[PDB]
A paper describes a structure:
NAL catalyses the reversible aldol condensation of N-acetylmannosamine with pyruvate to yield the sialic acid, N-acetylneuraminic acid (Neu5Ac).
A mutant nanA gene encoding the K165C S. aureus NAL was created using site-directed mutagenesis and DNA sequencing confirmed the presence of the mutation. The structure of the K165C variant showed no significant changes in the overall structure of the protein compared with the wild-type enzyme (RMSD over all Cα atoms=0.34 Å). However, the observed electron density for residue 165 did not extend far enough for a lysine residue and was better fitted by a cysteine residue as expected. Interestingly, the K165C structure more closely resembled the enzyme–pyruvate complexes than the apo structures since the loop region (138–146), not generally resolved in apo structures, could be clearly seen in the structure of the K165C variant and the side chain of Tyr137 was also positioned more similarly to that in the pyruvate complexes. Calculation of side-chain solvent accessibility for the K165C variant showed that the cysteine is inaccessible explaining the need to unfold the protein prior to chemical modification. Despite soaking K165C crystals with up to 100 mm pyruvate, we were never able to observe electron density for substrate in the enzyme active site. Experiments demonstrated that the cysteine side chain in the native protein was inaccessible to the reagent 2,5-dibromo-1,6-hexadiamide used to generate the dehydroalanine residue. Nevertheless, replacement of the natural lysine side chain with a thialysine residue is still consistent with activity and the rate of the reaction is enhanced 360-fold when compared with the inactive K165C variant.
Author numbering:
A (entry chain B), D (entry chain A): 1 to 293
B (entry chain C): 2 to 293
C (entry chain D): 3 to 293
Amino acid sequence: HNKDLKGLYAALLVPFDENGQVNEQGLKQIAQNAIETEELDGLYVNGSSGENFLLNTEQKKQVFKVAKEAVGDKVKLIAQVGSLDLNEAIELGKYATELGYDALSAVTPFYYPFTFEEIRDYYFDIIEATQNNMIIYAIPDLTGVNISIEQFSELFNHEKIVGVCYTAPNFFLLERIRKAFPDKLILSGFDEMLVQATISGVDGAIGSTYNVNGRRARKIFDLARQGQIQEAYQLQHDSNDIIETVLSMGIYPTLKEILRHRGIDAGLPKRPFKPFNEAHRQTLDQLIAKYDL
Amino acid sequence: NKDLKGLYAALLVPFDENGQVNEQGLKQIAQNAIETEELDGLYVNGSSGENFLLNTEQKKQVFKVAKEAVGDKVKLIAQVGSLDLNEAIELGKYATELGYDALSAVTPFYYPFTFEEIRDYYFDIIEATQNNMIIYAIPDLTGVNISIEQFSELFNHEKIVGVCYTAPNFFLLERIRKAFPDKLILSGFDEMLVQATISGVDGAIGSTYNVNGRRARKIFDLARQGQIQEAYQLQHDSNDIIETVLSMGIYPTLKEILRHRGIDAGLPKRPFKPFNEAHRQTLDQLIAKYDL
Amino acid sequence: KDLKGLYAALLVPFDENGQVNEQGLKQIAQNAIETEELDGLYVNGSSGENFLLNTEQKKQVFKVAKEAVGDKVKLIAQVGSLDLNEAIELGKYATELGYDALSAVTPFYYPFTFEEIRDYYFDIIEATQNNMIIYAIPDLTGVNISIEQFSELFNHEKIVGVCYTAPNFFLLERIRKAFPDKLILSGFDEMLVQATISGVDGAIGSTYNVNGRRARKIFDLARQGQIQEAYQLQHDSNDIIETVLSMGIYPTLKEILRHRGIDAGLPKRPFKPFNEAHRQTLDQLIAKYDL
Amino acid sequence: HNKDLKGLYAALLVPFDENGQVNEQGLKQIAQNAIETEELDGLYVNGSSGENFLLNTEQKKQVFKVAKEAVGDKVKLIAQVGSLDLNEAIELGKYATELGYDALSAVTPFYYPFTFEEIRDYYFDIIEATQNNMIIYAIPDLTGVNISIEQFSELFNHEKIVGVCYTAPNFFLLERIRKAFPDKLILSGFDEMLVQATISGVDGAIGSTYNVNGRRARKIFDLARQGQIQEAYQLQHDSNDIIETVLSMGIYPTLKEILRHRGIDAGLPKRPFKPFNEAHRQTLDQLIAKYDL
């Protein structure tokens, strides 16, 4: 049953106004873009890419509400509810669950040097008070937390921890996890290594660049699994041009600018993130023309 | 207009089973710091207060309780930094209106913010609050490191009055002391208080000063009176204590030490786990050896 | 020759005094070619306990390895050292023996600047007149090479490729795209399948000393779009790799070789010998995978 | 009557010709400068600052012999013999002991991920083969290896592991080591932190900058020990101006430029180290003038 949530997901980006308030109308357009135009399977809501950790609780609910209203019932929805405030995490978990989100996910607790048992019981406490399926959100590069195979075994021993959004750049640890946990869901989080993740047996992927590059991403995934490896990899080359450029210019503002070119009310990033820098505008215009973004 | 020199307690916070502030116990913790531990001031809503686990209303609640529990002679610094800048500004306005002497803010963490993004977070808070600001630098929790050149650009701001410096680098500390002779430097590593003091710091903020403030003042005073042999010996003893408390879970364990004095020390906030009782004996041995 | 293909990072057997066992070394060399069916030997790399050796022992390893195998066998000589004089002496020595290319570890320990790293490669090249492969092993050296820095290095016509051990598939893909005509040999045995689909030209590995047949099928199947089969042999191969790493890779690999009648000797101290408390577990692995 | 090993040591620099060969006459001058001009207690020979890890065995012996023959019989001499090749370490350990060196030291084995028991028996094997006293050479910034308090206790259990050259930036660990081992020799290795090391109870120090700045170093050490801490710290301010400058310029070639300025044939660095960059000359001359180097 744990493979229900397989597929490609947009890590939903969020447009803000000048005071860091959610632009609800552009958000509806970003959600719709990712399903109708980028033809993806679902939305990963209030993750790192949605600037989620800059938000207050009310804004997070506001994003959850608008994202679900914006899509049809066939669209898969994962609610990222992890927070350093466990009371908040539970509140948001109950909220997203009552709305009908298919699964929750939660960042590994960060900032403080939490012990593994403290990290473990954080997942267990959210599960118990929300009774929803849970996906571990592992982004070592943001959290400084690393999860070993032994720790994954303890976590995966809970029947409601159904899988992981996996972001460690380690394809040895990825393969071991894949072999050790054949029935759990693994969605990879490194857009720039989608093809390698695909051939390592991932069940899908969650990505910020799929908001603008979701159709090449689906081909990478499909071609690689049909053993069209050369063709899959050439698409990874193209995708990585996109990813590398968008990374050099500031990822979330730049992605939202590509969506603006599509006529989306892409608003602004939430301070302390700065708005897209115009010194980049022409290189970005070149990229958009080159890859038809 | 107080100078902000001296020794501060990084205020610990007692919670109930639900993660709610025990207001009664917190008032006790605050007064212990001032009355028993003879400290110059309180550093409020910092990492040791379990601040990053709290909601906005709880942070305000801690600020108000702390301020009400202390006299006017007491120096107060309000840590208002948050990944949500609107919240930081909200909290900055609130603590300022309560009469806190300065704000401080943690360097923005999690996301790989550029330095210019970090700088304008400090500038934006100052300019909505008009209070003096202290850079809260804890590379070990934030993963952010500030260079001499970057302190130079920040200290150029009239309202950035100094730094809470919890980096372990004594070359960098010396360079900063020399480069910025009229800025405030408070050290944040309790276990290197004696090296900090002889490196010319203006004072210190620490969580162990909640239980070991008498020795900490002696290290501070003795090292400056050049009675360094004796100041370092107290550092050996302090560091015995810091070592033990760290191995036991520092915040729960410090509040367990405070329980022993009849303080309503409550719980840590989940996901922090409470004091493990397997440690109870060794802790009793420590409280006993060091008269804690 | 073209230098594409699968190479054994040649292991070296020692006596109790850390002297090279030349008969054992011959048998290891021949085992890699005849039994493991590999294309070449990568000689005096990290896996050969090279950085524990003296200069005359390194010369000894180069001579014995070349003499052990036939003319069709591809031979790469790692001559990099913190001692550039030694690096040059060794590069000349291996070039004179007829090694196909030289390779050289990024200078480490001292915080060399890039320009100092770059001219170390250029200085070895000038003195030897042989083709050079960058030996990039950040986990042992602590040195990382940027795409920018690879570009500067690859401008040199005699810097012909890279033995690539960084566990970073974004950087690997960048390099492959930027340098379609350079030779990329991957260094991580446990990620051969990901490396192969990222378009590497071959691989250098210590575990290929005992698992070269499976490695070849990983390589070949992945390139034929037989991607599930290739991945399955990666699972199998990674069981082996994980086990051997947990026991102490060099002495354990040489212990698997000793099970074939090879005089695999001892590791060089400060490396300790294979620990007997691992023997049953290792025997079970050998049985499981027919090693 | 064997020597008390307390005091201030120059980390001996080595001058090279255009082919990376030792200049013995310059080397003798550098050695005598450290004792007679800089008034230091001892030489630490064939450490990192002597560019030792760039040398062949015959060169290392050249250096041991010349440094020994340059100085009087009261001059303290510590021989760094550690190597990735244990056979070489043993050989040099014997060579240096036969020369009359007061102690050996040995870098923690590096490059390969040796277990700690492997590291330990590396020291115990050198000791057994040489029967001289041994100093742990801990330079984590170069070796990438860290020794914990518990690891120190096990090494220090050996009667012939007599102390540590502690070139490691951690003052909490330094204090623990000091507290646990009142019977062991601690020489600190960070010049820029000599005042902090002094008040933390070290027995002395080994430094490359003491080749040009040993007179200030001694006042820092002596003053701080006598409680005159503000004067000591002011000299740390001054000394760190020199150290920061010399680090910015390329430390070994620059220190050797400073010595060339006093009439010493300080030669060249050994490649891959590049020579002093002339673009730094004016800044260097300004430093020499300011502090009378």
